[PDB]
């Protein structure tokens, strides 16, 4: 499915951090573009750890999911580099990075309208996936990328894209899934094979909580055992201090998966504010 990119056409530059069994770099791809123009394009290079090569299928299936459909709110995958012993996903480089970092850095100048616009865009991307019956499986603020900053001077809203989910929770070790509470929904802690469209509605709620909490991580003070007991006791997240979306967050984070609202209903709710 994926376009194969030669290792020789890729330059690896600085490490940007780590994902689950991955290391992430900024790089450059040399390519021929439209009209035969030569380009040296900034790219995100996502590299599967050699020690976890056994996850390669799920590693690439994540990307393949995103590239099944084309949409203005979904990250572009340029291709893969599987030369030699490396498993590399090549993705569009998104200048302003992921939303959790951006929210933490830019608290003082992010207001409720900015959060509402971003929430609406994420809901639009999820409605598109839901209409296509395509599960994402790892909606969270780290996987939302800021393409364009809000410019109140020209009325331009911010613009985000949803990035790929990474290796699926259906294959990850149990301890990692538990560390990912409360993004991973309770039914998936009970049985990771319970991954379903309803999964994304729960994680969407958790992500809205991040958006409203300046990039804080919900339940970060709880170790894994306490996160588990949080689900066992059927707790909900505290309302963010900016609590405008708190009812929507809790409605999405419904312990009954069948009761979680459709993304059309979610969008209708967002539009009402």
Residues within the interface to ligand 3YT (CB under 6 A):
16-17, 24, 44, 91-94, 97-98, 101, 142, 145, 163
Question: Taking the complex as a whole, how short is the minimal distance between the CB of residue 138 and ligand 3YT, in angstroms?
Answer: 13
Reduced 3-state DSSP string for 20-38:
CCEEEEEEEEEEECHHHCE
Question: Taking the complex as a whole, how short is the minimal distance between the CB of residue 250 and ligand 3YT, in angstroms?
Answer: 26
- Taking the CB of residue 170, how many other CB atoms lie within 10 A of it? 15
Query: Taking a C-beta distance cutoff of 8 angstroms, is the pair 100, 141 a contact?
Result: yes
Please say which residue, 45 or 189, places its beta carbon nearer to ligand 3YT: 45
Please say which residue, 94 or 270, places its beta carbon nearer to ligand 3YT: 94
Name the packing angle between helices 197-212 and 263-271 (round to 10°): 30
Please say which residue, 186 or 214, places its beta carbon nearer to ligand 3YT: 214
Using CB atoms within 10 Å of the CB of residue 217, give its burial: 0 to 12 exposed, 13 to 18 middle, 19+ buried: middle
Question: Taking the complex as a whole, how short is the minimal distance between the CB of residue 156 and ligand 3YT, in angstroms?
Answer: 19
Please say which residue, 164 or 254, places its beta carbon nearer to ligand 3YT: 164
Please say which residue, 97 or 257, places its beta carbon nearer to ligand 3YT: 97
Question: Taking the complex as a whole, how short is the minimal distance between the CB of residue 66 and ligand 3YT, in angstroms?
Answer: 11
Nearest to ligand 3YT by Cβ — which residue? 17
């Amino acid at each position: 499915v994926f376009h194969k990119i030669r290792n020789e056409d890729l330059i690896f530059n600085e490490s940007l951090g780590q994902g689950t069994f991955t290391k992430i770099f900024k790089g450059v791809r040399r390519e021929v573009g439209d009209y035969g123009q030569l380009h040296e394009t900034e790219v995100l290079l996502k590299v599967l750890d050699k020690a976890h090569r056994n996850y390669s299928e799920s590693f690439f299936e994540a990307a393949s999911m995103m590239s099944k459909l084309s949409h203005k709110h979904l990250v572009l995958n340029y291709g893969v580099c599987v030369c030699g012993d490396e498993n590399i996903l090549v993705q569009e480089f998104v200048k302003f990075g992921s939303l959790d970092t951006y929210l933490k850095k830019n608290k003082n100048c992010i207001n409720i309208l900015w959060k509402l616009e971003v929430a609406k865009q994420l809901a639009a991307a999820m409605h598109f996936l839901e209409e296509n019956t395509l599960i994402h499986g790892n909606v969270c603020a780290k996987n939302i990328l800021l393409i364009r900053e809000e410019d109140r001077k020209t009325g331009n809203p911010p613009f985000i894209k949803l990035s790929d989910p990474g290796i699926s929770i259906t294959v990850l070790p149990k301890d990692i899934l538990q560390e990912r509470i409360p993004w991973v929904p309770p039914e998936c802690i009970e049985n990771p094979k319970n991954l379903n469209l309803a999964t994304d509605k729960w994680s969407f709620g958790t992500t809205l909580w991040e958006i409203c909490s300046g990039g804080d991580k919900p339940l970060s003070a709880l170790d894994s055992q306490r996160k588990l007991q949080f689900y066992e006791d059927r707790h909900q997240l505290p309302a963010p201090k900016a609590a405008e979306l708190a009812n929507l967050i809790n409605n999405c984070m419904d312990y009954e998966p069948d009761h979680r609202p459709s993304f059309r209903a979610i969008i209708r709710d967002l539009n009402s504010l």
